[PDB]
Every structure is written in C-alpha cells, then in structure tokens.
C-alpha cells in the first residue's frame, strides 16, 4: 500500500553532482571572493573569521595533506571542542577524499581509544587541551603517525600547528584559487565516520550532498538570504552539529559558536549578533522553559529555534516558543545512522509536538510491532526510513548493520511514531 508510505517531495533545487568536498569548495570559493563575509564567530573570545580566511586555510590544508601523502585509503581524526579552527581539517580532508572521524572531546583515554581503534586514523588533529589524551592513545595505536595542533599559530610542545604543517608541505607558488578538489565516486568514498560500546558510522559523500540539498531548501531548510546569522552551541563532532554547520557554510551564513553553555552569554549573543536562528538540544530546551531572563533581551531578529539530538516533548516546546515570542519550534528527527534529520518541520508549517515531514529523497513508514505491516494515518508503530542519507554501515560490524537495516534498505529506528492527515510525523 503505497498510500501509507510517506514520501518527501522533490527538492526545490535539483540535487547537484559532485562530491561533498566539491560542493563545499565551490560555495566557499564564492563567499571567499567577498571581503568581510563572516564564516564563524567565537562568542567567547569575540573573534570572527571570514570565508576568505576559511577557504584559503582549508585549501592549503587539503594540498598539504595530499603532499604529505594522504589519499582515500587514509582517515584523520579531528578531536576538539567547538572552535574557529574545527572545520579547517574537516573541509581540507573532504576536499581530497580523506575520511574524517570526529572524536568526542570529552571522551577519556579509554573511550577515545575504542573510537580510534575503529576509525584507525593516520593523522590526528587535536586542540591543545586534548593533546595529552591523544598522546596516551597513540601509545596503544601506532597507526597514528602524526599529531597536528589545531588552535595554535606556532608549533606547540614540539608538535606542528596546522599553519606550520602547511608551510612544511606546500609547493612553492601554491595558489589557493587555482586549487581543484579531488573527484571520486561519492557513493563509495566515505566522508565522515561518526560515533554511535560506540560503533563507527560510515557516511559516504553522497549523504552529505543530500544534506546540502535540504539545508538550503526553502521548505526543509533555510532560504539563502544575506547577513543571516545562526547561534550554535551544539557539539560539532555530533551529527546535529556537524551537518547543520556544513549546511550553513554551503549557505554562506555566519555561524556564531559557543563551546560551553551559559545563560547570559547565550541570550546576549542572540541579541547582539541579531541572530535569526538558534540550535538547541532537548536538555537546553528544558533549561529555557525554566529561564526568566529571556524577556530582558531584544530578540526581535530571532525567527526560529531548532531542536535536535533526541525527540522533544510537546509541552516543553510550547513553553519555549512562547517565552521567545515564536509561533512554534523548528523540530526534526534524525539518528547518527541517518546522517542528520530525515523528518524536518517545513518552514512556516510547524505543528506542536510534531517532528515534521519526510525530507526530499526519503520515504518513511510506521510498522505494526506485531504484524510488521505498514500502518495508516494516526496509527502507532515503529518508525522506519529509507533514503540516500542512510549510512553505508557500521565500520567492520556487518552483524550490527544487518540488525538495523533490512534487505530492502529500510532502517528500523527503534522509536514509536505515527503520522497525521497532513503527513506530519509525531514521535511517541
């Protein structure tokens, strides 16, 4: 019964060809050619970095990694708190087809070791505060040949920074604007290995390309408008942070980041940066349902709040929307294994407690927990989705992959849901 399979509509703009690296490179080069266009802002230290700076450093890192000897057979780890530098090695690696494994920066040595035993990186990019943990991990994982310090200009404790690493490897006369990213099969070449003991979730370049279609979709994402700023406190090494931020770079937005939540800084940032959209996780929603400071700030520019990371209760969402003077909350539902959200609230068509509608290129159904039958409108069962953002599999764990994804390509989410007469989905 096809009528009970909910399908996303066609994307507003056709899906572009090219790897995720090629698409990011093309967009970022465009924004780079306009001086002063801000890519990231660190709300804590107040420093801005422009698309020109970001584009040039990411391309220099790409070329330096290529000359050092990395290619599609290798992986890198990026282990850092949210920062201005976080996406430099991410973009550089995407530009040359090297898979990136972001490691949670609050993991201890044991958890890092398990994570990197799965991803098996050749080079680790780490912030200064993570260096000791990586050195302890490297003791057990000799495959790590090289450690590069992200948030330093000069060498740091005998290790190269991204800047000195680049100088060591760039050819004379290197031209960042002549550089061309690598081309490769985007279904076969892994872009990210995300953590989900945790497993490693392999995401081909294809899944990011589809994400970039959603991110700028006028219905399922944000319309590309000049001078748009987002406030993001969500960890970049988690899918909600990783894939919203890459999407924002495609859109040329200003991404104001925080690496630690604080109430006054968060609200003052919304006000002073004239933020249009802010990203929260459910426990920060619960926090703002308790906040009374919100009405002391001028939030007249705020258009939306998005919640991701885990389903949000209906009542908490309604409380927060009211405190912020918004008509509703921009919800979505995703898993690490689906790259990002594959149900998203359509712009202007929020419905309290709903996680939204099936995104372009996807299908979703709910199945009876007994009969396995596809269910109709307003009936509760297991949410199952199928589409090109689904992971290629858990790394070196085909049994775990097969337990989650069936022979027809349906991923079984483990969550109970239903959809309504407008094809809005609700998580129960």
Ligand X SMILES: CC(C)(O)[C@H]1Cc2cc(/C=C3\OC(=O)C(c4ccc5c(c4)C[C@H](C(C)(C)O)O5)=C3O)ccc2O1
Question: Nearest 5 degrees, angle CA 280-CA 81-CA 131?
Answer: 165
CB 162 within 8 A of CB 57: yes
Question: Nearest 5 degrees, angle CA 162-CA 130-CA 39?
Answer: 50
Give 308 or 360: the residue with its C-beta nearer to ligand X.
308
Candidates 8, 102, 200, 221; binder of ligand X (CB under 6 A) is 221
Window 186-215: residues binding ligand X (CB under 6 A): 215
Candidates 21, 130, 181, 309; binder of ligand X (CB under 6 A) is 309
Smallest separation, CB 266 to ligand X (Å) = 17
Give 162 or 335: the residue with its C-beta nearer to ligand X.
335
CA-nearest of 210, 209, 266, 208 to 234 is: 266
CB 223 within 8 A of CB 242: no
Give 159 or 394: the residue with its C-beta nearer to ligand X.
394
Residue 134 contacts ligand X per CB under 6 A = no
Number of residues that bind ligand X (CB under 6 A): 22
Smallest separation, CB 410 to ligand X (Å) = 18
CB 381 within 8 A of CB 367: yes
* Token pair 């200064």: residue: 128
Candidates 330, 357, 365, 386; binder of ligand X (CB under 6 A) is 330
Residue 334 contacts ligand X per CB under 6 A = yes
Smallest separation, CB 71 to ligand X (Å) = 29
CB 118 within 8 A of CB 110: no
Smallest separation, CB 240 to ligand X (Å) = 4
What whole-number distance in Å separates Cα of residue 106 and Cα of residue 236? 12
Q: Give the dihedral of Cα atoms 211, 212, 215, 219; nearest 10 deg.
A: -90
Axis-axis angle for helices 87-96, 51-68 (nearest 10): 50
Residue 353 contacts ligand X per CB under 6 A = no
Handedness of CA 7, 317, 428, 207 (dihedral sign): positive
Residue 340 contacts ligand X per CB under 6 A = yes
Taking CB under 6 A as the binding criterion, the range among 21-29, 88-96, 336-344, 405-413 that sits at the site for ligand X is: 336-344
Per-residue mark of binding to ligand X, 225-254 (x: CB under 6 A): --------------xx--xx--x-------
- Helix, strand, or coil (residue 62): helix
Residue 308 contacts ligand X per CB under 6 A = yes
Give 123 or 202: the residue with its C-beta nearer to ligand X.
202
Backbone angles phi, psi at 49, to 5 degrees: -125, 135
Per-residue mark of binding to ligand X, 264-303 (x: CB under 6 A): ----------------------------------------
Smallest separation, CB 390 to ligand X (Å) = 13
Smallest separation, CB 102 to ligand X (Å) = 12
What whole-number distance in Å separates Cα of residue 376 and Cα of residue 39? 44
CB 128 within 8 A of CB 151: yes
Smallest separation, CB 253 to ligand X (Å) = 10
What whole-number distance in Å separates Cα of residue 56 and Cα of residue 277? 27
Candidates 47, 106, 143, 310; binder of ligand X (CB under 6 A) is 310
Taking CB under 6 A as the binding criterion, the range among 109-117, 158-166, 169-177, 306-314 that sits at the site for ligand X is: 306-314
Taking CB under 6 A as the binding criterion, the range among 66-74, 121-129, 285-293, 335-343 that sits at the site for ligand X is: 335-343
Q: Which residues contact 285 (CB under 8 A, 6 or more apart)?
A: 307, 312, 316, 317, 320
Candidates 28, 39, 113, 306; binder of ligand X (CB under 6 A) is 306
Give 161 or 338: the residue with its C-beta nearer to ligand X.
338
Question: Nearest 5 degrees, angle CA 340-CA 345-CA 346?
Answer: 115
Residues making contact with ligand X (CB under 6 A): 215, 221-222, 239-240, 243-244, 247, 306, 308-310, 330-336, 340-341, 344
């Amino acid at each position: 019964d096809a009528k009970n399979i909910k399908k996303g509509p066609a994307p507003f703009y056709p899906l572009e060809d090219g790897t995720a690296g090629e698409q990011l490179h093309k967009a970022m080069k465009r924004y780079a050619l306009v001086p002063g266009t801000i890519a990231f802002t660190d709300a804590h230290i107040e420093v801005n970095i422009t698309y020109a700076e970001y584009f040039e450093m990411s391309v220099r890192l790409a070329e330096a990694m290529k000359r050092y000897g990395l290619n599609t057979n290798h992986r890198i780890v990026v282990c850092s708190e949210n920062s201005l530098q976080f996406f430099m090695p991410v973009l550089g690696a995407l530009f040359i087809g090297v898979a990136v494994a972001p490691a949670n920066d609050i993991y201890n040595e044991r958890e890092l070791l398990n994570s990197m035993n799965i991803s098996q990186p050749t080079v680790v990019f780490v912030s200064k505060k993570g260096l000791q943990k990586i050195l302890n991990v490297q003791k057990k994982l000799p495959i790590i040949q090289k450690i590069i310090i992200m948030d330093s200009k000069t060498d740091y404790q005998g290790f190269q920074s991204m800047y000195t690493f680049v100088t060591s490897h760039l050819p004379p006369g290197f031209n960042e604007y002549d550089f061309v990213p690598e081309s490769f099969d985007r279904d076969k070449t892994i872009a990210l290995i995300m953590n989900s003991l945790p497993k490693g979730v392999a995401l081909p370049h294809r899944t990011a390309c589809v994400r970039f279609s959603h991110a700028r979709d006028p219905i399922f994402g944000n319309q590309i408008i000049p001078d748009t700023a987002i406030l993001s406190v969500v960890p970049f090494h988690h899918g909600f942070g990783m894939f919203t931020t890459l999407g924002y770079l495609i859109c040329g937005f200003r991404v104001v980041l925080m690496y630690r939540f604080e109430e006054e800084l968060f609200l003052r940032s919304l006000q002073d940066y004239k933020i249009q959209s802010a990203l929260l996780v459910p426990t920060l929603f619960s926090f703002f349902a308790k906040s009374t400071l919100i009405d002391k700030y001028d939030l007249s520019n705020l258009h939306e709040i998005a919640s991701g990371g885990a389903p949000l209760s209906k009542e908490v969402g309604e409380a927060v929307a009211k405190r912020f003077h918004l008509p509703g909350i921009r919800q979505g539902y995703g898993l690490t294994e689906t790259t990002s959200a594959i149900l998203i609230t359509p712009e202007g068509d929020d419905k309290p407690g709903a996680v939204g509608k099936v995104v372009p290129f996807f299908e979703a159904k709910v199945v009876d927990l007994d009969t396995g039958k596809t269910l109709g409108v307003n009936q509760r069962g297991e949410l199952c989705v199928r589409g090109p953002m689904i992971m290629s599999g858990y790394v070196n764990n085909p049994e775990a992959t097969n337990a989650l994804i069936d022979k027809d390509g349906w991923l079984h989410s483990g969550d109970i849901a239903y959809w309504d007469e407008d094809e809005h989905f609700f998580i129960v």
